[PDB]
Amino acid sequence: YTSAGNVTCWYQTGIVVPAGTPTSCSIMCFVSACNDFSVRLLKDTPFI
């Protein structure tokens, strides 16, 4: 109900550690725009 692309991530193997290291961990995502970005029709923002 979007008509947009999507991204997903899957466990291929699983995480393997030696003795004496933390068990769980984390991933972080960063987003940005590439040089070819364009905008039109200045309007008012819906946040204030």
């Binding site: 466990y11 291929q12 193997t13 699983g14 995480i15 550690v17 030696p18 003795a19 290291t21």
Partner: protein, 245 residues
Amino acid sequence: RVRSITLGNSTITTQESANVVVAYGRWPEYLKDNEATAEDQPTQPDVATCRFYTLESVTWERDSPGWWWKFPDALKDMGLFGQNMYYHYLGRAGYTIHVQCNASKFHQGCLMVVCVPEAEMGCSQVDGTVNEHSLSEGETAKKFASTSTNGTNTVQSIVTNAGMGVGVGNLTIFPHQWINLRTNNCATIVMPYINNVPMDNMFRHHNFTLMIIPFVPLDYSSDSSTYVPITVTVAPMCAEYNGLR
């Protein structure tokens, strides 16, 4: 020191320090033009056959004998490359296979990754015949066993004879790569099309077989993860079919 590779609308990431085996020295290519000039005209898709397809990961535990896949028909449900298998009567293709592991410096183990042409397999009963389901299950892997198997119509899959009646220490004669958790975790194999005819039908013949076999089992200690994931990614190269017009 990381490279990012895009094929079509797919993107994966590898390390630029990769090592690549080109199977017998031969890169894939089109059968050039004039083996069968007059009424044998081929066509090529080059649309969404050249793209990365990623299977489900497998789970490497302490007692894992190994895994195998058959090519093609591991890709008979994979989007367009699978559609072309039903629409066309003859075809051919080469492949690029990436195999990756996710492990830490506190794990240890060793894998052989080998691509075997014409891997004809034996039955568990000496005066028997193998079934079609026991040879492959498509995009799901079959499993080797650690002892000798029984039951009707099953491949005899004891891992020391690799289902072919040879010694498994001698499979290095084929295009192969080693994965030692100590020094690397990835392997790329580029396979060309190998047959005794130029084209063929892709449903009743298995061109080659990909096998993954642990030679030193996975070991870990106190509170590391108890498994390691392995991931396989395939990109078809220079695919070509019979013309329809």
